[PDB]
Amino acid sequence: DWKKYGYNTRALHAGYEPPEQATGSRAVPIYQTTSYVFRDSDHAARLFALEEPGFIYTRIGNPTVSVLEERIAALEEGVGALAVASGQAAITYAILNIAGPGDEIVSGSALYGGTYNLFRHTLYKKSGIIVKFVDETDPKNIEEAITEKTKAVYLETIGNPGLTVPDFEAIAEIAHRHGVPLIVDNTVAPYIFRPFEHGADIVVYSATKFIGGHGTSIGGLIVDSGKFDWTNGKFPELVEPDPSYHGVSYVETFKEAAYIAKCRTQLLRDLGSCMSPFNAFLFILGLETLSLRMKKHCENALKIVEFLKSHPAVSWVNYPIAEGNKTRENALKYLKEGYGAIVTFGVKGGKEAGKKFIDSLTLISHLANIGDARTLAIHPASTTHQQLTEEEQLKTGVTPDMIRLSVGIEDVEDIIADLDQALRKSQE
Amino acid sequence: DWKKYGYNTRALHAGYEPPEQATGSRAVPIYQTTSYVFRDSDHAARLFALEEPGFIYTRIGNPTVSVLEERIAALEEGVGALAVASGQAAITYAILNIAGPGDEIVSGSALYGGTYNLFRHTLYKKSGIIVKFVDETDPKNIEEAITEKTKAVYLETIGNPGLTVPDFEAIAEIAHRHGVPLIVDNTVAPYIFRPFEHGADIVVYSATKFIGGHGTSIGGLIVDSGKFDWTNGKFPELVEPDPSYHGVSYVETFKEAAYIAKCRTQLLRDLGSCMSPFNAFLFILGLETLSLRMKKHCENALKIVEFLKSHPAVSWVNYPIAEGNKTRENALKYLKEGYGAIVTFGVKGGKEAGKKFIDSLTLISHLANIGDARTLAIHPASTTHQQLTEEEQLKTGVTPDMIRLSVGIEDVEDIIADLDQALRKSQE
Amino acid sequence: DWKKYGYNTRALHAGYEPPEQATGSRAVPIYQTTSYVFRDSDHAARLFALEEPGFIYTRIGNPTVSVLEERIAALEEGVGALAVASGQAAITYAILNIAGPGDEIVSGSALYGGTYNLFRHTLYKKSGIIVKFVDETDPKNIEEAITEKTKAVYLETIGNPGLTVPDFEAIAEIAHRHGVPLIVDNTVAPYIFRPFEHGADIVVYSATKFIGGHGTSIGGLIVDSGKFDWTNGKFPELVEPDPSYHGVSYVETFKEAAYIAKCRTQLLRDLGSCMSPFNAFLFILGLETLSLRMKKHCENALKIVEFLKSHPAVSWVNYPIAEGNKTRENALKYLKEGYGAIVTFGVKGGKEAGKKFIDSLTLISHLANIGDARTLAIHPASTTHQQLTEEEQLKTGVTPDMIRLSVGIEDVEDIIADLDQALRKSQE
Amino acid sequence: DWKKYGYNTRALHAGYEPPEQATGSRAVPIYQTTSYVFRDSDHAARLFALEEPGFIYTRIGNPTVSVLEERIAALEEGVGALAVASGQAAITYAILNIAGPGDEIVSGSALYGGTYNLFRHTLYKKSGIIVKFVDETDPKNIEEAITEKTKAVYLETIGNPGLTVPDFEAIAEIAHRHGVPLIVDNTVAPYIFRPFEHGADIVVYSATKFIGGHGTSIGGLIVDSGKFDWTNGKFPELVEPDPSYHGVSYVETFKEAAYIAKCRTQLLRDLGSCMSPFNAFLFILGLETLSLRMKKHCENALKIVEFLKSHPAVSWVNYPIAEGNKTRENALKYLKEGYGAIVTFGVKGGKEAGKKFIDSLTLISHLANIGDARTLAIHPASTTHQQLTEEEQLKTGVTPDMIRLSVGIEDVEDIIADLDQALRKSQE
Ligand SMILES: C=C/C(=N\Cc1c(COP(=O)(O)O)cnc(C)c1O)C(=O)O
Ligand SMILES: C=C/C(=N\Cc1c(COP(=O)(O)O)cnc(C)c1O)C(=O)O
Ligand SMILES: C=C/C(=N\Cc1c(COP(=O)(O)O)cnc(C)c1O)C(=O)O
Ligand SMILES: Cc1ncc(COP(=O)(O)O)c(C=O)c1O
Ligand SMILES: [Mg+2]
Ligand code: NA
């Protein structure tokens, strides 16, 4: 449960030791409730005033959700975590907790298409936040984009689907020198990469993906390392008395957990992007097998890459350590326990033959998701990144002929068998 | 399912006739999935490009949630509905869909404390929206607050816990004359009041409360009447080509459902406050008995009021048709099928004896919720409205001595008995 | 929770007051767990030895399931209840708990088709129990069938679908004088009839039906009145030391609850017909509206009967108080709060026109169930009672032309409207 | 999905390819319904008469449960499977399908205590079946116990907790030569052992254990290999016309699936030990990681065995391949992919020091279960096998000082640490 225990021990125990005291239930109960009876009038007031911890209302906190949050925090070795309705909500909250109208964010370009559209369109239109996209393959572009309005630097661990890996430590040094935190979306690399150990201050997850692992539940997570000093004047909301809580100071009351505390008391309570206790239950079950699944995902993915490189129908193949990958060196440096499950390739004939490939699949699933146990395929340019212009797609690494694979944990020969027949048919 | 069928028939059938065609399941299945397999590449492209309706990803839409959405729409006689993670998210989305940084909102003052804090602080700090609180008990106050930056007028059906009822028709005329829609929070009066029949253009619900009815699940709903013309120049996002969808015009493509459509394609997709399919399943079950429960709720409330008015320990009692209610006339006009389940009262001895009353309850539950099947009690000044200053509390109708009851559907004799013993103990 | 509180108060509170002590969750949590951590080695031993109550293993007992059991017991005013996988399982356990190879059961003939087949075939072939079916419309037939091997007398409250009602008190007098308990399947009449107030010793329910009320979940319940003396020598398994529990005597240890206690420690533990915690959660929600739904069911049923009596397409109509019903007097005597939701009728043209009626329904659902909120229809001779010979069907009240309705809680005008169009098509 | 695909591919796809056709949901929906709308009167009649397959009623079959059933059958390469409420119910149904009053079963003695109690007491008292327990470590004991009343031979793969492994092939030869099937309880060895490849005809599982893998859900499975000829005269119920289905012959109508078909149409339909769709949903998720979890379970168990053998506090250690194990040879021959997760040992000081060991655990959970992801410990003599006499306990391999471990998938260092500290305290 603590930092002394192994990763798999934590994934099975952290946040729920001892078990619930009334009945001793070994599994995390599904507290499908909105409300909780208070001990007395004074207890209720202390709870609402942030003077005592406890459960008040499922929008703000819930015992099932708390187990997931505390377990994620222990696995990331952070000071606390917060679960929200979706990955999008986690990214939105992570930004909104330290940024507002007029503020800026410096973001990498290897982004999931929904993150780009949020940064490029929705956050500007609705929150007045101005995101400056840069080529994070060169840390200098991060440095040169930072202004006095920048509030954070944002990166994806392995670009979806660019498959580029930024130089985390070099970029973190730059962000901290300018007094801003580094935010890392570790959606595609839980367990196999520890962002906090390489300069990241905040980590967000799409729990929907590898953390859940079974494609059953939408969810998002925010994890606070507690390592960042919020008192440099650039984040007064975390320092100054909060009028909505009659003067509470997050840095004073919550100390290293100031950031993740305000995500709950401010953003979750008012904006209301809360996770269902049922979804949290399913995410907890997913965590219990994460390390086993990631190892298989990455073992199979490497074999898929080798198969695609030698197939006559395949124009090109990309993977974080591919010979042609611009950031191959970073991947070798930072990814010591697998290079991810996402594999991209192009089929001879361009976009048109790719569609024949997708339409010929008999086992691989054509759908919008990643990090399911099943192997998945999709054409990002018309789907996950459809919202972006042709040039914006190129900036994220999406080409008109790109096929995106999420290599699952089937027996790899059956994955390869389905790929081969579909590729041969694609050349007809 | 259609407008020809009764309320209860619709509450049992609308949105799910015929049953799911693969197996014929009479109950609404729980589609606890993230993703859906596409027929082919062209099908996937048409879905993502908004050219054909269908299911893409549970963050954006889901078959279980769709049944809830369509059934609520049928019960409200709207053109469409959208389910979100919570009542707060529904309110946030309802505003953000037609308002942004610099824009203004005219809002009533009888607000749930979380709505007030959202309007007063969070929407300002995070979205730059300026909410103008007014005394909605006199329609003139609405008119005089509207400027050329106003995007909507916002009201609660029966103030939580002010118990004031605004003049819906009069305010709707004012909002429409200035070319802005009326948004009505009908959380506390589903079935028993139809805002669309009295000038409202958008309705939001905390489904958490009476719609669910059993205190199991957090949820929110947005209902679009389809009656409002968005083309007067004040809502360009609904008319002009959307850059994020390569030129789609919401009024052109979706006609009467433009508003609720952008709620989904923009706000739900990017901000990510999605509802769980499991929660929607439970809300659907609640709707099937809603009319029966509301009738019982309101019948018990009338008797509880009579009992409290005659008790020696009770300083005052409020209810929408109480003689002393400032908006008694509006309540008599608009509330023809029950005056709600919420009852407020003061105990001799002020705040101190009130706290003893709460602490002496043995059957009524001391918790934060309304619209549960069980009878509930709380002290709003220190709980639901703690975030507000003393003067803001008075503006919402919360007094330091106020006890709020949510009268449940127990046998009324047992409710009265628990009140009586606790009221007598409060005088010791 | 106690006998002092009203039925609806109990339906909202009994078995879960106070709420679960660890978190105070107002809703009954879903303890989807198999196992429970024991305090110590000695605690575990005392639990397994039946020396102390507690939770051991979900096959045997579960906190969510316990609330349902304790709540059902409070509504029936019994000493205890047991939840099982299905109504069939409840009936199977009720019999096997006091009968074995060579023993006899005296049963009425107005039986659900699955109960008849269990009694006539499966319990004989698999347990050696010999069921003696009699015409329970005359209590004398019960008396004359009892032998020294008889272990119980079994009845349905309102025959499904014979719609006959036995003389409960007269039959109870007969059974008790012969030293055997009366078992009553109250599936179709919860709340509206209390068998314990009219001589019944044990009650079973298909929780699937009206108790759930929404057609989501299969479940069964066994309720023990505690009124029957098991020491007359005809039930030594309930008196003698149990070798499997090292000498425990159920009457000595469990006193009035000896019968329901062995159902759990013996039949549930070894035969394993356990209910899921999730299902119990849903039945608990159903109980909270049971009285409201049953009243509506019965109000609508009376109106449907009158409509069918006047329709030109209808050959005949039956209801417990119909002029031609053999047990109209029993129905008038015992059913003081509604006569049930089941209605049977025949259409001119016999069996062939009946099929045309069923196939012409557009709102009433053609499926196998009763006591759903929706109105249902089926042809028992080919479905629920298909397993029975022609003569056995007649003994249960099923005729070749019989259509069975389960009148739901839609607005009655929509039910009648759908009936009318479908009956007219049946005559074409 | 078919026999050509690997085990893990089948574990991810079999039974749900293609996805449900109405919405294409990639995850298996939770069909939490009781009933299904029929196409027409003739369709309903054909279903109930067993003339066409389809869904009728969740007690008998359900689309979510069917996916679990078909996936288990595909993993076992059997002709079909049936899901029931519990492992106990699976064992009960497997026996009752081919046995009745007066019949005999030849069973091994290395049994779970609940199976022993079912065989020794409940099946005798309630079904008149006479189980003859033998020492299955010598196949001759099976041969010499068979009479003309024998209907099956029953074995556990790895005795719980005897840890003995029978000679499956030798016993299967004896059973088949005498014209009776071999039934194998493979609860503790899914994936790692394939009973059908070694003479077994029927396999039963407690899905509760490793198949679920997370201690969330009670469930049982019956798997039919389809290999056994039921027409040798010893099983007339599977050949002769069935009176309850108006002459249907299971061998004639269902061919290789005769046995598993009658389990459903007779035993499940009438005795009613049905599984919840929600539980089945969770079992499907568990299967997706089964091969991963089983490998880790067995790797850790081998290391735990090594650690216990060298600890000064440990009197003895048992494991399927332990030097002192009577069936070490059988274990080496049949178990080529892991020797299970269950490990037993005794502590110096006998029963008294063992209790101190159990009471000193801080990470390993003291509860009644096996095959959870967490490491578990219990004292079988006072818990799982308490119902057995001292002599019966020894015959199953349970000694007064035996501690049973279910080694989970934590990091093995943390498991050893908790064992070590607890063993040291046991010597004080
Ligand atoms: C404890 C919550 C209470 N009320 C919540 C509420 C909300 C928020 O909805 P949720 O986010 O909680 O789902 C929106 N609108 C109205 C009118 C409300 O009363 C209450 O009992 O005072
Ligand atoms: C679909 C089955 C029907 N009825 C079931 C039933 C049962 C069995 O209970 P379950 O196992 O199905 O839960 C027991 N007793 C009575 C009175 C019943 O009507 C029906 O629609 O006619
Ligand atoms: C407490 C239960 C335990 N075991 C149960 C079990 C069963 C019964 O299955 P269920 O009814 O519990 O699902 C059948 N077969 C075997 C081999 C078993 O080990 C245990 O902890 O040893
Ligand atoms: C890398 C990454 N970040 C964020 C998201 C958004 O996740 P969610 O679907 O849970 O909102 C996704 C979804 O594709 C993703 O892949
Ligand atoms: Mg700078
Ligand atoms: Na003792």
PDB file of all heavy atoms in Angstrom, chain C residues 408-428:
ATOM      1  N   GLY C 408     -50.337  -3.789 -16.694  1.00  0.00           N
ATOM      2  CA  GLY C 408     -49.275  -2.956 -16.160  1.00  0.00           C
ATOM      3  C   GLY C 408     -49.788  -1.612 -15.692  1.00  0.00           C
ATOM      4  O   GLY C 408     -50.988  -1.412 -15.488  1.00  0.00           O
ATOM      5  N   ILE C 409     -48.861  -0.670 -15.526  1.00  0.00           N
ATOM      6  CA  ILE C 409     -49.185   0.623 -14.933  1.00  0.00           C
ATOM      7  C   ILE C 409     -49.101   1.758 -15.954  1.00  0.00           C
ATOM      8  O   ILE C 409     -48.964   2.919 -15.570  1.00  0.00           O
ATOM      9  CB  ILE C 409     -48.306   0.914 -13.708  1.00  0.00           C
ATOM     10  CG1 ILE C 409     -46.838   1.050 -14.112  1.00  0.00           C
ATOM     11  CG2 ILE C 409     -48.472  -0.199 -12.681  1.00  0.00           C
ATOM     12  CD1 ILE C 409     -45.915   1.386 -12.953  1.00  0.00           C
ATOM     13  N   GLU C 410     -49.207   1.449 -17.245  1.00  0.00           N
ATOM     14  CA  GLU C 410     -49.386   2.500 -18.232  1.00  0.00           C
ATOM     15  C   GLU C 410     -50.699   3.233 -17.970  1.00  0.00           C
ATOM     16  O   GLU C 410     -51.539   2.800 -17.179  1.00  0.00           O
ATOM     17  CB  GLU C 410     -49.403   1.927 -19.651  1.00  0.00           C
ATOM     18  CG  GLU C 410     -48.113   1.266 -20.124  1.00  0.00           C
ATOM     19  CD  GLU C 410     -48.121  -0.241 -19.954  1.00  0.00           C
ATOM     20  OE1 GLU C 410     -48.984  -0.750 -19.207  1.00  0.00           O
ATOM     21  OE2 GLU C 410     -47.266  -0.914 -20.580  1.00  0.00           O
ATOM     22  N   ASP C 411     -50.878   4.363 -18.649  1.00  0.00           N
ATOM     23  CA  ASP C 411     -52.188   4.995 -18.642  1.00  0.00           C
ATOM     24  C   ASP C 411     -53.186   4.068 -19.319  1.00  0.00           C
ATOM     25  O   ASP C 411     -52.947   3.593 -20.435  1.00  0.00           O
ATOM     26  CB  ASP C 411     -52.134   6.355 -19.339  1.00  0.00           C
ATOM     27  CG  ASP C 411     -51.180   7.309 -18.656  1.00  0.00           C
ATOM     28  OD1 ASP C 411     -51.554   7.874 -17.609  1.00  0.00           O
ATOM     29  OD2 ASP C 411     -50.040   7.462 -19.140  1.00  0.00           O
ATOM     30  N   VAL C 412     -54.296   3.796 -18.626  1.00  0.00           N
ATOM     31  CA  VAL C 412     -55.190   2.702 -19.009  1.00  0.00           C
ATOM     32  C   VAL C 412     -55.795   2.931 -20.390  1.00  0.00           C
ATOM     33  O   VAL C 412     -56.142   1.971 -21.091  1.00  0.00           O
ATOM     34  CB  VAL C 412     -56.276   2.509 -17.929  1.00  0.00           C
ATOM     35  CG1 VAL C 412     -57.220   3.703 -17.886  1.00  0.00           C
ATOM     36  CG2 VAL C 412     -57.044   1.218 -18.166  1.00  0.00           C
ATOM     37  N   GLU C 413     -55.931   4.192 -20.805  1.00  0.00           N
ATOM     38  CA  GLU C 413     -56.482   4.481 -22.125  1.00  0.00           C
ATOM     39  C   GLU C 413     -55.601   3.908 -23.229  1.00  0.00           C
ATOM     40  O   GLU C 413     -56.105   3.415 -24.246  1.00  0.00           O
ATOM     41  CB  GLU C 413     -56.653   5.989 -22.298  1.00  0.00           C
ATOM     42  CG  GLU C 413     -57.199   6.686 -21.061  1.00  0.00           C
ATOM     43  CD  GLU C 413     -56.102   7.161 -20.128  1.00  0.00           C
ATOM     44  OE1 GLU C 413     -55.111   7.740 -20.625  1.00  0.00           O
ATOM     45  OE2 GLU C 413     -56.231   6.953 -18.903  1.00  0.00           O
ATOM     46  N   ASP C 414     -54.280   3.980 -23.054  1.00  0.00           N
ATOM     47  CA  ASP C 414     -53.363   3.422 -24.041  1.00  0.00           C
ATOM     48  C   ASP C 414     -53.390   1.899 -24.045  1.00  0.00           C
ATOM     49  O   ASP C 414     -53.221   1.282 -25.104  1.00  0.00           O
ATOM     50  CB  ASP C 414     -51.950   3.945 -23.783  1.00  0.00           C
ATOM     51  CG  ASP C 414     -51.883   5.464 -23.803  1.00  0.00           C
ATOM     52  OD1 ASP C 414     -52.424   6.065 -24.751  1.00  0.00           O
ATOM     53  OD2 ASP C 414     -51.302   6.058 -22.873  1.00  0.00           O
ATOM     54  N   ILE C 415     -53.595   1.277 -22.881  1.00  0.00           N
ATOM     55  CA  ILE C 415     -53.744  -0.176 -22.831  1.00  0.00           C
ATOM     56  C   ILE C 415     -55.004  -0.598 -23.575  1.00  0.00           C
ATOM     57  O   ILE C 415     -54.980  -1.502 -24.419  1.00  0.00           O
ATOM     58  CB  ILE C 415     -53.764  -0.658 -21.370  1.00  0.00           C
ATOM     59  CG1 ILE C 415     -52.480  -0.240 -20.651  1.00  0.00           C
ATOM     60  CG2 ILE C 415     -53.938  -2.186 -21.293  1.00  0.00           C
ATOM     61  CD1 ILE C 415     -52.483  -0.537 -19.168  1.00  0.00           C
ATOM     62  N   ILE C 416     -56.119   0.075 -23.293  1.00  0.00           N
ATOM     63  CA  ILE C 416     -57.381  -0.267 -23.937  1.00  0.00           C
ATOM     64  C   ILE C 416     -57.310   0.006 -25.436  1.00  0.00           C
ATOM     65  O   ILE C 416     -57.808  -0.784 -26.247  1.00  0.00           O
ATOM     66  CB  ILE C 416     -58.535   0.490 -23.255  1.00  0.00           C
ATOM     67  CG1 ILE C 416     -58.828  -0.133 -21.885  1.00  0.00           C
ATOM     68  CG2 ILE C 416     -59.777   0.500 -24.133  1.00  0.00           C
ATOM     69  CD1 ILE C 416     -59.764   0.677 -21.023  1.00  0.00           C
ATOM     70  N   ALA C 417     -56.679   1.116 -25.828  1.00  0.00           N
ATOM     71  CA  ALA C 417     -56.546   1.437 -27.246  1.00  0.00           C
ATOM     72  C   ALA C 417     -55.815   0.333 -27.999  1.00  0.00           C
ATOM     73  O   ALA C 417     -56.217  -0.047 -29.105  1.00  0.00           O
ATOM     74  CB  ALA C 417     -55.824   2.774 -27.415  1.00  0.00           C
ATOM     75  N   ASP C 418     -54.728  -0.185 -27.423  1.00  0.00           N
ATOM     76  CA  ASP C 418     -53.981  -1.245 -28.092  1.00  0.00           C
ATOM     77  C   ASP C 418     -54.772  -2.546 -28.117  1.00  0.00           C
ATOM     78  O   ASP C 418     -54.741  -3.279 -29.113  1.00  0.00           O
ATOM     79  CB  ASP C 418     -52.632  -1.461 -27.412  1.00  0.00           C
ATOM     80  CG  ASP C 418     -51.740  -2.410 -28.187  1.00  0.00           C
ATOM     81  OD1 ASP C 418     -51.896  -2.492 -29.426  1.00  0.00           O
ATOM     82  OD2 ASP C 418     -50.901  -3.091 -27.559  1.00  0.00           O
ATOM     83  N   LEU C 419     -55.476  -2.854 -27.026  1.00  0.00           N
ATOM     84  CA  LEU C 419     -56.336  -4.035 -27.003  1.00  0.00           C
ATOM     85  C   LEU C 419     -57.391  -3.968 -28.098  1.00  0.00           C
ATOM     86  O   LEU C 419     -57.640  -4.955 -28.800  1.00  0.00           O
ATOM     87  CB  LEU C 419     -57.001  -4.170 -25.634  1.00  0.00           C
ATOM     88  CG  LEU C 419     -56.131  -4.611 -24.460  1.00  0.00           C
ATOM     89  CD1 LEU C 419     -56.895  -4.431 -23.166  1.00  0.00           C
ATOM     90  CD2 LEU C 419     -55.716  -6.065 -24.641  1.00  0.00           C
ATOM     91  N   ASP C 420     -58.032  -2.806 -28.249  1.00  0.00           N
ATOM     92  CA  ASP C 420     -59.168  -2.695 -29.158  1.00  0.00           C
ATOM     93  C   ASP C 420     -58.755  -2.991 -30.595  1.00  0.00           C
ATOM     94  O   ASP C 420     -59.359  -3.841 -31.259  1.00  0.00           O
ATOM     95  CB  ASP C 420     -59.791  -1.302 -29.038  1.00  0.00           C
ATOM     96  CG  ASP C 420     -61.073  -1.163 -29.836  1.00  0.00           C
ATOM     97  OD1 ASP C 420     -62.093  -1.767 -29.440  1.00  0.00           O
ATOM     98  OD2 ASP C 420     -61.068  -0.433 -30.849  1.00  0.00           O
ATOM     99  N   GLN C 421     -57.712  -2.313 -31.087  1.00  0.00           N
ATOM    100  CA  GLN C 421     -57.263  -2.533 -32.461  1.00  0.00           C
ATOM    101  C   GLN C 421     -56.841  -3.981 -32.688  1.00  0.00           C
ATOM    102  O   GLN C 421     -57.107  -4.553 -33.752  1.00  0.00           O
ATOM    103  CB  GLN C 421     -56.122  -1.570 -32.809  1.00  0.00           C
ATOM    104  CG  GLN C 421     -54.809  -1.789 -32.062  1.00  0.00           C
ATOM    105  CD  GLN C 421     -53.918  -2.838 -32.712  1.00  0.00           C
ATOM    106  OE1 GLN C 421     -54.099  -3.188 -33.879  1.00  0.00           O
ATOM    107  NE2 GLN C 421     -52.961  -3.357 -31.950  1.00  0.00           N
ATOM    108  N   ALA C 422     -56.184  -4.593 -31.699  1.00  0.00           N
ATOM    109  CA  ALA C 422     -55.716  -5.962 -31.876  1.00  0.00           C
ATOM    110  C   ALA C 422     -56.870  -6.956 -31.862  1.00  0.00           C
ATOM    111  O   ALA C 422     -56.817  -7.975 -32.562  1.00  0.00           O
ATOM    112  CB  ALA C 422     -54.689  -6.310 -30.799  1.00  0.00           C
ATOM    113  N   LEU C 423     -57.918  -6.681 -31.080  1.00  0.00           N
ATOM    114  CA  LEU C 423     -59.074  -7.571 -31.074  1.00  0.00           C
ATOM    115  C   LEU C 423     -59.832  -7.496 -32.393  1.00  0.00           C
ATOM    116  O   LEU C 423     -60.272  -8.526 -32.920  1.00  0.00           O
ATOM    117  CB  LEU C 423     -59.994  -7.238 -29.899  1.00  0.00           C
ATOM    118  CG  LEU C 423     -59.530  -7.707 -28.515  1.00  0.00           C
ATOM    119  CD1 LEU C 423     -60.337  -7.036 -27.414  1.00  0.00           C
ATOM    120  CD2 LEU C 423     -59.617  -9.230 -28.398  1.00  0.00           C
ATOM    121  N   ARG C 424     -59.976  -6.290 -32.953  1.00  0.00           N
ATOM    122  CA  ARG C 424     -60.648  -6.154 -34.242  1.00  0.00           C
ATOM    123  C   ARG C 424     -59.895  -6.897 -35.336  1.00  0.00           C
ATOM    124  O   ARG C 424     -60.511  -7.549 -36.187  1.00  0.00           O
ATOM    125  CB  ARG C 424     -60.827  -4.678 -34.607  1.00  0.00           C
ATOM    126  CG  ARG C 424     -62.127  -4.069 -34.094  1.00  0.00           C
ATOM    127  CD  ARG C 424     -61.922  -3.180 -32.886  1.00  0.00           C
ATOM    128  NE  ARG C 424     -63.125  -3.093 -32.060  1.00  0.00           N
ATOM    129  CZ  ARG C 424     -63.994  -2.088 -32.092  1.00  0.00           C
ATOM    130  NH1 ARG C 424     -63.801  -1.064 -32.914  1.00  0.00           N
ATOM    131  NH2 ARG C 424     -65.058  -2.105 -31.298  1.00  0.00           N
ATOM    132  N   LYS C 425     -58.561  -6.812 -35.336  1.00  0.00           N
ATOM    133  CA  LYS C 425     -57.793  -7.557 -36.328  1.00  0.00           C
ATOM    134  C   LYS C 425     -57.954  -9.056 -36.142  1.00  0.00           C
ATOM    135  O   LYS C 425     -57.902  -9.809 -37.120  1.00  0.00           O
ATOM    136  CB  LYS C 425     -56.314  -7.179 -36.263  1.00  0.00           C
ATOM    137  CG  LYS C 425     -56.000  -5.761 -36.712  1.00  0.00           C
ATOM    138  CD  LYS C 425     -54.497  -5.503 -36.683  1.00  0.00           C
ATOM    139  CE  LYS C 425     -54.128  -4.222 -37.420  1.00  0.00           C
ATOM    140  NZ  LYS C 425     -54.324  -3.011 -36.573  1.00  0.00           N
ATOM    141  N   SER C 426     -58.160  -9.509 -34.902  1.00  0.00           N
ATOM    142  CA  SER C 426     -58.325 -10.937 -34.657  1.00  0.00           C
ATOM    143  C   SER C 426     -59.592 -11.494 -35.292  1.00  0.00           C
ATOM    144  O   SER C 426     -59.681 -12.707 -35.497  1.00  0.00           O
ATOM    145  CB  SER C 426     -58.340 -11.222 -33.156  1.00  0.00           C
ATOM    146  OG  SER C 426     -59.563 -10.803 -32.580  1.00  0.00           O
ATOM    147  N   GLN C 427     -60.571 -10.644 -35.601  1.00  0.00           N
ATOM    148  CA  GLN C 427     -61.812 -11.078 -36.228  1.00  0.00           C
ATOM    149  C   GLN C 427     -61.801 -10.897 -37.743  1.00  0.00           C
ATOM    150  O   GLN C 427     -62.860 -10.981 -38.374  1.00  0.00           O
ATOM    151  CB  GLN C 427     -62.995 -10.321 -35.620  1.00  0.00           C
ATOM    152  CG  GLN C 427     -63.111 -10.457 -34.111  1.00  0.00           C
ATOM    153  CD  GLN C 427     -63.257 -11.899 -33.672  1.00  0.00           C
ATOM    154  OE1 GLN C 427     -64.286 -12.529 -33.909  1.00  0.00           O
ATOM    155  NE2 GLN C 427     -62.226 -12.429 -33.029  1.00  0.00           N
ATOM    156  N   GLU C 428     -60.637 -10.659 -38.339  1.00  0.00           N
ATOM    157  CA  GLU C 428     -60.536 -10.505 -39.787  1.00  0.00           C
ATOM    158  C   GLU C 428     -59.774 -11.665 -40.422  1.00  0.00           C
ATOM    159  O   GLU C 428     -60.187 -12.206 -41.449  1.00  0.00           O
ATOM    160  CB  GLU C 428     -59.868  -9.172 -40.134  1.00  0.00           C
ATOM    161  CG  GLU C 428     -60.616  -7.958 -39.599  1.00  0.00           C
ATOM    162  CD  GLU C 428     -59.791  -6.687 -39.657  1.00  0.00           C
ATOM    163  OE1 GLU C 428     -58.636  -6.744 -40.128  1.00  0.00           O
ATOM    164  OE2 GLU C 428     -60.298  -5.630 -39.227  1.00  0.00           O
TER     165      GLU C 428
END
